[PDB]
Amino acid sequence: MQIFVKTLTGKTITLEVEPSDTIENVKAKIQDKEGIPPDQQRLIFAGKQLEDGRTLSDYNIQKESTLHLVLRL
Template identity: 55%
Template sequence: MNYSIQCYICREAAEDAVTSECGHGYCSNCINTWLNQSALCPVCKATISKNQLRKCYVQVLVGDPIISTQNFQIFVKTLTGQSLSIDNAHVSDSIRSVKEKIEKATGMPQSEQRLIFSGKQLEDNKSLSDYGFNNGSVIHLVGRLRGGLCFYEVTRGS
């Protein structure tokens, strides 16, 4: 299996990898271009500067963006017991992109999907790696809870 540090900006294997003080990894060119436009980390919005960047030689810490470059399969299970598989999933895939695949397969609009993994509701802007997905992981698909308060006018009959 091949491993590399993933750039949070281009989502590719980082070239000339560097990390910020907040711990996020990037391609040197990607983060330098980013910092020409913004002084905030693109991931956590912490203030960072070019002189705070550190070259990565080895980065093997739990939770760091070291990723497998291979795709894997995840499963989606509905409340009715149906199951579908999503092939070619990658740890960098966003939950939003997973919802797009589910919508194509089931017809259920993304806005009505709630995805649960390990007891947590998945957020659209996060990635599979943020939740610790790996080959064979199972997501539970449930519909959005519909709520609200209905008001009815009650009139007395004569």
């Protein structure tokens, strides 16, 4: 499946991933095409913040979902 991580610019990163994928892994993809260090990333999902050592599966994220990216203050 492929999910999308929208930035607060309205930019959308189309990421191809699997449910076995972890959040930091996802942040790796982000950085391999947006510059953003994983240190500053915060993948949001319906308000809930997504912690690193947890696979997408744990958050019950499905195909074509939409997550958001918000830089640490």
